[PDB]
Amino acid sequence: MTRGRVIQVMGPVVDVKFENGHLPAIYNALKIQHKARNENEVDIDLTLEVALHLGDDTVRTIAMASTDGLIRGMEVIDTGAPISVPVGEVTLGRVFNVLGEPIDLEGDIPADARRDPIHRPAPKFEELATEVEILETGIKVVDLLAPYIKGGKIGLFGGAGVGKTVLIQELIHNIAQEHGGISVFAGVGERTREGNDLYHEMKDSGVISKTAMVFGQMNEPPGARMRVALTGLTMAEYFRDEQGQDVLLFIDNIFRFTQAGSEVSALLGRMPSAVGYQPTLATEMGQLQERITSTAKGSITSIQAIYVPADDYTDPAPATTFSHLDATTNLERKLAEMGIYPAVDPLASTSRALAPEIVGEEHYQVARKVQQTLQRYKELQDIIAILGMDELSDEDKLVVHRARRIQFFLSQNFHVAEQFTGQPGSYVPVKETVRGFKEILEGKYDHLPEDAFRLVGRIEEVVEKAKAMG
Amino acid sequence: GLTMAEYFRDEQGQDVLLFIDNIFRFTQAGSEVSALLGRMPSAVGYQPTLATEMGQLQERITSTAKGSITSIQAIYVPADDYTDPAPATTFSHLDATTNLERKLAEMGIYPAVDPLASTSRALAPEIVGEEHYQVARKVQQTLQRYKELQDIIAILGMDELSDEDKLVVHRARRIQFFLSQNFHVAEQFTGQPGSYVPVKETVRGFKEILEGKYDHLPEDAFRLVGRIEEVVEKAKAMGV
Amino acid sequence: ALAPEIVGEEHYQVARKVQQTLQRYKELQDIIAILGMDELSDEDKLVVHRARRIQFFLSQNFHVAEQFTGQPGSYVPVKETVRGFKEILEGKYDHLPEDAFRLVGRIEEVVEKAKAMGV
Amino acid sequence: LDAKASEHAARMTAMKNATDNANELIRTLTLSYNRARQAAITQEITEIVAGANAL
Amino acid sequence: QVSDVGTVIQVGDGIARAHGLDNVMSGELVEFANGVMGMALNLEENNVGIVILGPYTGIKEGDEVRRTGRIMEVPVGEALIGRVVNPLGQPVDGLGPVETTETRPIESPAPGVMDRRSVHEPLQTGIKAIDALVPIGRGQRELIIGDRQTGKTSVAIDTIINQKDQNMISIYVAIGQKESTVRTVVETLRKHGALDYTIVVTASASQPAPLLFLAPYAGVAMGEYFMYKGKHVLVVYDDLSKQAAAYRELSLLLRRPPGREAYPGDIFYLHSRLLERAAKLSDAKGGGSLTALPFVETQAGDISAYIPTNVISITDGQIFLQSDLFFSGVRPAINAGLSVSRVGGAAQIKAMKKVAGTLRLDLAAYRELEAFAQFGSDLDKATQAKLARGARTVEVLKQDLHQPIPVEKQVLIIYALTRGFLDDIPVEDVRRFEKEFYLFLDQNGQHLLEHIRTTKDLPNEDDLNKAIEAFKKTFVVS
Amino acid sequence: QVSDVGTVIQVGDGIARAHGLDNVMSGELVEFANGVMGMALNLEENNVGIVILGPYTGIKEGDEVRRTGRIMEVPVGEALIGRVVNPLGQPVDGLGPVETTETRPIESPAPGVMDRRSVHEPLQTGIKAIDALVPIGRGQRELIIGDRQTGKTSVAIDTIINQKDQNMISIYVAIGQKESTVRTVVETLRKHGALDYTIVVTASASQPAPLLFLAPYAGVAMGEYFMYKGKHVLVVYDDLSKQAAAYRELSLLLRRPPGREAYPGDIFYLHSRLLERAAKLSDAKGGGSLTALPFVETQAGDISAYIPTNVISITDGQIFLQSDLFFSGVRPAINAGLSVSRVGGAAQIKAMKK
Ligand SMILES: Nc1ncnc2c1ncn2[C@@H]1O[C@H](COP(=O)(O)OP(=O)(O)OP(=O)(O)O)[C@@H](O)[C@H]1O
Ligand SMILES: Nc1ncnc2c1ncn2[C@@H]1O[C@H](COP(=O)(O)OP(=O)(O)OP(=O)(O)O)[C@@H](O)[C@H]1O
Ligand SMILES: Nc1ncnc2c1ncn2[C@@H]1O[C@H](COP(=O)(O)OP(=O)(O)OP(=O)(O)O)[C@@H](O)[C@H]1O
Ligand SMILES: [Mg+2]
Ligand SMILES: [Mg+2]
Questions:
Q1: CA E93 centroid distance within chain
Q2: CA distance E436 to F97
Q3: Which residues in chain B touch residue D44, judged by CB atoms under 8 angstroms apart?
Q4: Interface size, chain C vs chain D, as Cβ–Cβ contacts under 8 Å
Q5: From E303's CA, which of A117, A365, C35, F301 has a CA 20 to 30 Å away?
Q6: By the 8 A CB rule, do E456 and E349 touch?
Q7: Strand ranges (DSSP E) for E278-333?
Q8: At which positions is ATP bound (chain B) (predicted)?
């Protein structure tokens, strides 16, 4: 038996009564499709998700859309499975909602396509990778100071105009070009204007054909805003498990995911946690994050943008989110104004992978020396401001001479930045950037002008630019 | 009391003064019984219908075409927290607002009106006059500048202040002290009798103090004095 | 029991003076926290000088604590405690270093360990 | 001249030390403020829920 | 026996619970026996929770309540222009009926992702600071946030007044205010001539909570009518905090589970629904647009509260107003450091963009490096140049009440400031310089004004310097 | 007949309610229709409160619940050495079933006052800082406390590795950690040869809260099996804060009134039960010992928080790891000012203690 009836509606919460012995399972999807029987009714097309078993053959559900127009006693049908979204090559270049239905006007997916459940357990212990492996992104600053790890989670912090979107697009382009892996963008709590702008930017940059976009808009219910991240992760897991690829996953803002979870808990009536959050905050975060791992046949790496409430890093949501992160990237408006692209902060950014055991002794030493030199230059800034640079000792002037060149060499010309600069882009191997920074530190190019380092790829391009300048 | 005043406002068209001893007690009494009435508590333990009840009470106290009622109400602020829901909701119902802070009371300044937080819809150039508006704005600016200097003064001392800031403090202390007054009903607490100061006289006195005519006078001569004439006469008692 | 008719007049006076100096030091700690001891007046500097030594002399080495630090403990009569604190209040030992007042019993041990260290 | 140079150097060093101490105090006070804010939110929500379910 | 009728069981605090109403929809309108209306929000197993849209003192237990069969909706049309109206669409100023021949539902889907267009048209508010540092575009929703008695209402009124010579329709929604204050606002708008294109929606403090809850949605529907007709609409919400408080009161009276600070779990969803209906439509379905200016009142400058954080997350930008700035002499009181616009520069003309960059850097280099002024009195390092430039910029950004400035004059004065033509005028005379410079412009720079108004670009720099020097040689410094 | 068979009434958020089961006892194991285990928590007059020890999605109201007749127990034995198991003893490494032949209860009384002896045998951790400043004895309970990414796991792993040539059994319990990190820990232990004497109990962040709540007790029971047979055991709880959070979650879902920081009133008893089982037995009891090294994660170095204070009030000392000292290049960032061993020195050898 698969037919129920609506018995109680209170906002986004709907209770449905079923026949004895035929109750739906937890997280199962229920469908309401009603046509106006007369002038006093309205058409309904709504999807529900089972949350609790209240007893007496009643089930409490959360709606994925507006509940306006619902009438008690109207028929509900059970699909017998959780929410299922299409997976495969058909999802590339398309924009979806939380239900897996396309938002764009390119047409609907045929019913014969494969679909996968949104809710599933994390990969087992013996299916995981046995060693830590570094993911080469092709960006000099990232590959040197904050290396990325296959299967790891990276936090992203930045301002309004730092260039987060450009960095995301460049990461997508580089991974698709050099590793053959697709990327998935999950718009958790995405503004509609921002989503439209992002879609047009992706189409202009051309990385749209290598990415699948899922948008959960602000005006959608907390259930949809909760499950958008899960449906994006489900779309990525297909390419991890079947094609064996290395896939990238982007989350618009995980804080909105936690807040949607808290709102759902409040609507369900569960008692609040320490600072008003849901009791299951850690469980939900772990269930989301533990599926983003590296297995024996592939990996998924994820980039989270994180909002810190009241700038307090001790707040429970940032405290729980930070427990799963492996790296951190901070974008600086100072560098953005100075002309440094990518605007990645060389001192604030941190990474667990920057250890000699896994990144290499030479790489570790070069990175530490670069950071030390930049810290010394930062320390000397006030005295350079107050007094002329000549007043500094010869050692301090040499330090500044090295540091300015290093700071300029940290920049890079991006493939997606051709629309802004006319010039092509570069993909720099980690060994190449390590060798270049080592040569710069050894004083090999002290006689070259500082503007030859401004926007290049290999270290040889600095020499070529200097030769062209004359 | 409101309906007793409303009868006079409507039927006879009289001008009515309405004085309310404490309007916060209405809110407190309404909140004392909400739980027994069976309503779930609100943020700070108030009743859910706080704003609705307050508006339904306050909106009857208005002036109409048949008559006018001017009402002066005393509003209690629990624990000196102006962010409390009852004063926060009450703020939107008023045209003119007087704020009393116990920081001025601890220092011996009465009536201890906060010179900045107090607001009024009548303080406009076309309502009160250009000279009055400018002198009031200058007084407010001077006091605002003074408030910032106290934090650094309390640590580094007055000696490290610039010549401009020293003069700012010098005039601001005198202005704040001259803001005091002696009330007729304050005889029980001060011994000395009260006074009545007109608006023109107080504007003139504050203009003189802003111009700096009485920089040489001691600051204690401005305490509960009324006019500046009484300031300069009280100075004679100290030999200045 | 801290009453003049119970513990004695001089006991009560010494206790009250110690509490007063400690209260003054607690008040000054805010200023020393930010800008140090340089801007304190000559009175406040002497108050700090006496208060630090009083606070350190309030420490004692216990018999039970011999298992943690190998030093043996001490038992101090109340008369000796009163005499020592009165002497410290009077300024007899202003020249001794403040680290010589820690974990000792009678006031003679302060002098003994100050002599043991450089003095 | 030597006295003036020494005075200026001493003032510079003292002000640097004072600035560092003030920054550390700001950091500690901010930590305490955040803890107090979290505690206040916890207390208010606990009282709200207790009153709500006491019916 | 019929299922389109019921009897009331409980009455109190503005809500009613009725037995029956088997076929009632969620959010449907219902009519009581005495003639008052209600909205069915809670559909329990055996009873319906109804919020009453009027005086509930006439309703008794056991009386009849009937179905209406339709969702809540309000009249829409050009007849509402110049009228002050309640959220139900009934006039409150007298002056006769409204004579509106069309209606629109309160709850309507927002425009989709593919229905929209990028924001590219400026919304000129007439405020120098807003137009230069936090641009607002047509279709953008910008939050105006600050404490009490800081100037949010003044900013809104100035923005509404400035729309006189532009094809923009304004809607003002007053929530929880005094009817006397609404009357004063309407009188000022009538005096300045804004009622020729303005609609006022009022839900005063004496009205039932559901009316305060529904007022912004009625305003949104009235704006959406013109937007889908192909025009441009500006909608202002004078307080969303009072609407949220009314919704909280209704939810607590209906016995729904409370969340943080007693607010219900869907309080964020409510405001996201409200603010997501402002959009800039693609040319495929007309170029009309709707821009929103929600207001939020903070307590002691706390922007970390529940509703402030929700609205900050939802909106496209924030304008922060500070009380210390207000009392320091900066009457607009806009904190340019914290105020942010996420569509900026796409919402500005070329002439404004060519000076706003320099203005922003000057203001930042003043705001930081401030507190050196007292030690900058002892002239050191020539940083006094930056200090003087920042002081003059701050003096330029000041503005008076109900005196919006044309965008061309704003561009000209900002050019004069940023190019160093004010460096020898003392800060005490900057206001007089600007006031007389506007008259000198409208007397002898009509060519420059027309060039800016037509081409949206700066005139020749040589001609600009000639005009500025000509005025400056006549300006007497005192 | 509903004596040994029940029927589910309510299911949700990992807590179920059953009708019947008249003969079930408090704390008993129950088995659901799909093979998922459960624990009988509350014996109401009409219904039974059951805590689901696994994925509760497959459990629907109206399903059958049957008794197992056994108090909550875990399998123990020497066959468990070198294996990775869940808190219920089910292997997760994929090497096949574990051939244990006996079990022990999860809840068991601690050794009495007269059953104990003073700690006098050194536990050599192989780390100079700890072995010098904060000596650890066999039978001691020492807390390791610090912020995130400070080296607590590295200290624990080094201590476990150092026991290669010493008669010690090591148990590593990871509560709420990442599965990839546990996999790397297991690989490092295998590479250094510690799997010959180590049992690994894991409960990742994606597991339900009851498993995280039960894991430390399963670990301590596995340790007690060897401890009461005359051997010496070392048990490491990789995070007690995760267990405390899981228990707070479970209590809030049971609608018990919260207290300080929304924690329940028995959060102290929760850890006191677990940590009071580690002891040094007397000669009459066999002379065995069990050593515990619980972990606590602080926020911004706040050692005065509720959970850190509770754990400090239970153990025999603490080792504090300082974040800014860790970032300054002193990787074994032992803060000597705030680190103390209350029963150390008596265990330290004579040569070291001078
Ligand atoms: N690598 C780059 N090369 C050149 N210009 C760049 C680069 N990155 C960013 N920019 C410039 O900075 C602007 C802002 O970049 P972008 O649109 O990515 O901002 P964002 O920080 O991602 O935005 P938001 O926070 O609003 O989503 C771009 O429009 C472009 O003009
Ligand atoms: N630019 C300005 N110049 C001079 N006076 C101003 C200016 N802006 C606002 N004011 C005055 O400051 C006060 C602020 O009133 P306004 O209604 O604008 O503030 P508000 O923030 O909406 O306050 P509330 O709704 O809490 O009363 C009024 O007296 C107004 O006349
Ligand atoms: N003695 C050491 N020398 C060098 N590196 C070390 C040392 N101890 C720890 N590390 C490194 O420092 C980091 C600390 O990680 P570790 O897991 O040991 O800490 P933790 O406190 O358990 O952290 P988490 O909260 O992430 O579990 C790791 O990268 C580790 O390799
Ligand atoms: Mg206002
Ligand atoms: Mg660890």
A1: 23
A2: 93
A3: 43-44
A4: 13
A5: F301
A6: yes
A7: 289-297, 317-321
A8: 121
- F238 labelled binding-site residue: yes
Q: Which residues contact A21 (CB under 8 A, 6 or more apart)?
A: A1, F62
Closest CA to E267 of A314, F24, E275: E275
Measured from the Cβ of residue E156, the count of other Cβ atoms closer than 10 Å reads 21
**Domains of chain A by residue range:** 3-84, 85-351, 361-469
How far apart CA B11 and CA B67 sit, in angstroms, is 9
Neighbours of E350 (CB within 10 A): 12
DSSP letter for E476, please: P
Way it was determined? cryo-EM
Q: CA-based angle A22:A25:A31, to the nearest 5?
A: 80
d(CA E50, CA E28): 10
What is the set of domains in chain C, with CATH numbers?
9-116 (1.10.1140.10)
Cα distances from B196 to residues B71, B223, F272, in angstroms, run: 22, 15, 73
> Residue F148 annotated as binding?
yes
Q: Does the CB atom of residue F154 touch ligand 3 within 6 A?
A: yes
Resolution in units of Å = 2.9
Q: Is residue F189 included in any domain, yes or no?
A: yes
Indicate whether F10 belongs to any domain: no
If residue F31 lies in a helix (H) or strand (E), which one and from where to where?
A: strand F28-32
Catalytic residue IDs of A = 164, 190-191
Number of neighbouring beta carbons within 10 Å of residue A439: 13
Give the whole-angstrom CA distance, residue E196 versus residue A446: 70
F313 within domain boundaries: yes
- CA of residue A367 to ligand 3 center, whole Å: 19
| Residue A392: exposure state from Cβ atoms within 10 A (0-12, 13-18, ≥19) | middle
E117 is in an annotated binding site: no
Residue D34 and residue A310: Cβ atoms within 8 Å? yes
Range of the domain at F123: 75-351
Which chain C residue is nearest to residue D23, measuring alpha carbons?
C34
Which fold, A361-469?
Answer: 1.10.1140
Q: With the C-alpha atoms ordered B23, B26, B27, B28, is the resulting torsion angle positive or negative?
A: positive
Note whether B41 contacts D55, CB cutoff 8 Å: no
Q: Is the CB of E399 under 6 A from ligand 2?
A: yes
A3-84: in CATH 2.40.10.170? yes
Task: In whole angstroms, give the CA distance from residue D20 to residue D24.
Answer: 6
Q: Which two tokens stand for residue A372?
A: 């030390």
Q: What is the CATH number of the domain that holds F82?
A: 3.40.50.300
Size of interface B-C (CB pairs under 8 A): 3
Q: Please report the residues numbered 39 through 68 in chain C whose beta carbons come closer than 8 angstroms to any beta carbon of chain D.
A: none
F289 found inside a domain = yes
- Chain B CB contacts of C34 under 8 Å are 155
Query: Can you tell me the distance from the alpha carbon of C22 to that of E30, in angstroms, rounded to the nearest whole number?
Result: 74
Interval between CA E150 and ligand 2 midpoint (Å): 5
* Distance, CA of B130 to CA of B118 (rounded, Å): 19
Which residues of chain B does C35 touch, with a Cβ-Cβ cutoff of 8 Å? 155
Number of structural domains chain F divides into: 1
Minimal Cβ distance to A121: which of F55, F184, F255: F55
